[PDB]
Design a protein. Sequence first.
Length: 180
Amino acid sequence: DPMYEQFLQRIQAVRTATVAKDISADILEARHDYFGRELCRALDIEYRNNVLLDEIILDVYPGVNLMEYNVPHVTPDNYIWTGDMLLILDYKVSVGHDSTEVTYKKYTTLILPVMQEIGINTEICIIRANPVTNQISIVGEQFKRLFPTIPVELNFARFFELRKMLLDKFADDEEFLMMI
Ligand SMILES: [Mn+2]
Ligand SMILES: [Mn+2]
């Protein structure tokens, strides 16, 4: 895959702490976007990765008088419109649940009020892949009802290989460790 060869190239070339730190964040972000692609592929839903709430609202409800509402500036990864319900989706890749809970409460606080004013029935849904075990957790009762089985075949091994190589290269680097 070109993406792996691209990270390998940057790891091969990297010399400085600040450039190393950005490779690390990029790998973690690509792991997340890789899961998002595979997730939507397994579900037969269109793939998206960060859609402004404004554009979600105009997509499902183009005749809304949008100028009457204060739509918070927020970009969930994706959404599904079942013709009756709007499911807000965010992907996660994590061994723990803490990041899931933070996004859940943020979207519940930021998205749900205005969707209720407008009158679109909405549910926040979060799908987390444990990157070690490949196990899929879901929050969102309606999402679980419409997808009782999630036929994903995930492999995150290459993302660990790449990050491990970078962390080995800067094993001593104090400045670098100060940004994990
Ligand atoms: Mn996102
Ligand atoms: Mn996400």
